Design a protein around this ligand. Structure first.
Ligand SMILES: OC[C@H]1O[C@H](O[C@H]2[C@H](O)[C@@H](O)[C@@H](O)O[C@@H]2CO)[C@H](O)[C@@H](O)[C@@H]1O
Length: 370
C-alpha cells in the first residue's frame, strides 16, 4: 500500500502541476505533511499497473472517462462529501464521477476543445469545416497553412467524427449499451473521410502531433489549431494575437467534442485518505487553490460555483462552455479504454493510408464490440 504519512500526486504533464505544487506548499507549511507532485508519462496507463500492486500516488488526476475502469478493478476509494460540500459544485459534475451510484472522485474542471485562431492571419474564423481547403490554398500561397492539430490522439479528431452522427456507446434507459457502438455508421464514415481528404490533398499531414501543432501555431505558421484550455498559457507567452471560438460545423451540424471532467481520485491503497480528503476539499477545491493552478495552466470551466462565477465572463471560457454544450460528456464505463485504443488505431491507419476509412472503422467496430 506503501505511501507513508505524506501525499504523492500524479497529474498529466499538460496541466498546471507547478500551480498544484504551490498548493501542496501551503498544505505542508500549515500541516507538516509534505506534498510531492509528479507528472509521469502515460500515467493513466501507469496507474492501474502500480496501484494494482497496492502502490502508486495517494491521489490521481485524470479526465473522468478512465475512472469507471479504475473503480471496477477496485483502485479507488469511495469519497464522502456532505451535501454542504457537495453543494459548492455543479451537480452534473458529481454525476460524471459516480460509478454504480457511489462517488469515486472529486470533479475539478470541465474540459472541451475549441477552435483557436490567429487574429492577425484570420480576423474572422471559418464557420465550416468545408471552407477550410479553400482557405489553406490562399494561405499557402503566402507560405502559411490554415490548420494544424494533434492527429495522433483520437480525442482531437472525435468532434468531426461525431458531428454528422458517429458515437461511442448508445445511452439507452439509464445505461450505456456496450454492444451498440457508432464508430462505423454513416456519420462517422463521412467525418473520417473528410479528414483523410484533407491529408490526401496536402492541406494537412498525417504525422502532426501535439508538439508540431503547438509550435506551428505559436510561431505564426498556421492560422488555427484545436486545443483545450491548458494550451492557452504557451500561446499567451508567444504573444500571438489569438481568439478562442466555437468549432466549425460539418454538413451543417455542430462539431461535438467529447467533454472531460478533470478529476482527483484517492488510491484505495493509501494510508493517507484523511489527509488526501483534507487537501482536496479544504485546500485545492477552494477559490484560492483553483486559482494557483489556473494561473499555471488554465483549467477551463471549474466545477466550484464560486470560482466559476469569476471565470467566465472570460470569452475563452464562454467559448469552452459553448463547445461543451454542443458536445457530450464521456461515459466513464470500463469499456472507454477499448473504445479509445480501437479509435486511435483506426484514424492513424486511415490518415496514413494503410487502410481505407470503411476498412478502418469496421475493424474498430469489431474490436470494440468483441
Ligand atoms: O485521445 C484519447 C484520450 O482522450 C482523452 O484524453 C485527453 C484528456 O482528457 C485531456 O485532459 C488532455 O490531457 O488530453 C488528452 C488527449 O491527449 C481521455 O481523457 C483519455 O482517456 C483518452 O486516452
Amino acid at each position: 500500500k506503501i505511501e507513508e504519512g505524506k501525499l504523492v500526486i500524479w497529474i498529466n504533464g499538460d496541466k498546471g502541476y507547478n500551480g498544484l505544487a504551490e498548493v501542496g506548499k501551503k498544505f505542508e507549511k500549515d500541516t507538516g505533511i509534505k506534498v510531492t507532485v509528479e507528472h509521469p508519462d502515460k500515467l493513466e496507463e501507469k496507474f492501474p499497473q502500480v496501484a494494482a500492486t497496492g502502490d502508486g500516488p495517494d491521489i490521481i488526476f485524470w479526465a473522468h472517462d478512465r475512472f469507471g475502469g479504475y473503480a471496477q478493478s477496485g483502485l479507488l476509494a469511495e469519497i464522502t462529501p456532505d451535501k454542504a460540500f457537495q453543494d459548492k459544485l455543479y451537480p452534473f459534475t458529481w454525476d460524471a464521477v459516480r460509478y454504480n451510484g457511489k462517488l469515486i472522485a472529486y470533479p475539478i474542471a470541465v474540459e472541451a476543445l475549441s477552435l483557436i485562431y490567429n487574429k492577425d492571419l484570420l480576423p474572422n474564423p471559418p464557420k465550416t469545416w468545408e471552407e477550410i481547403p479553400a482557405l489553406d490554398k490562399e494561405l499557402k500561397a503566402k507560405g502559411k497553412s490554415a490548420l494544424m492539430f494533434n492527429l495522433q490522439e483520437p480525442y482531437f479528431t472525435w468532434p468531426l467524427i461525431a458531428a454528422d452522427g458517429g458515437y461511442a456507446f448508445k445511452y439507452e434507459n439509464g445505461k450505456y449499451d456496450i454492444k451498440d457502438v457508432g464508430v462505423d455508421n454513416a456519420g462517422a464514415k463521412a467525418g473520417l473521410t473528410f479528414l483523410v481528404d484533407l491529408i490526401k490533398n496536402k492541406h494537412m499531414n498525417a504525422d502532426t502531433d501535439y508538439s508540431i501543432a503547438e509550435a506551428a501555431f505559436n510561431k505564426g505558421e498556421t492560422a488555427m489549431t484545436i486545443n483545450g484550455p491548458w494550451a492557452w498559457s504557451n500561446i499567451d507567452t508567444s504573444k500571438v494575437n489569438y481568439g478562442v471560438t466555437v468549432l466549425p460545423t460539418f454538413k451543417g451540424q455542430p462539431s461535438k467534442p467529447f467533454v472531460g471532467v478533470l478529476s482527483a481520485g484517492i488510491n484505495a491503497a493509501s494510508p493517507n485518505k484523511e489527509l488526501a480528503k483534507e487537501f482536496l476539499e479544504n485546500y485545492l477545491l477552494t477559490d484560492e487553490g483553483l486559482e494557483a493552478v489556473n494561473k499555471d495552466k488554465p483549467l477551463g470551466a471549474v466545477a466550484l460555483k464560486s470560482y466559476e462565477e469569476e471565470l467566465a465572463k472570460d470569452p475563452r471560457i464562454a467559448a469552452t462552455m459553448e463547445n461543451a454544450q454542443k458536445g457530450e460528456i464521456m461515459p466513464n464505463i470500463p469499456q472507454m479504454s477499448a473504445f479509445w485504443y480501437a479509435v486511435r488505431t483506426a484514424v492513424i491507419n486511415a490518415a496514413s493510408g494503410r487502410q481505407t476509412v470503411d476498412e478502418a472503422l469496421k475493424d474498430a467496430q469489431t474490436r470494440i464490440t468483441k
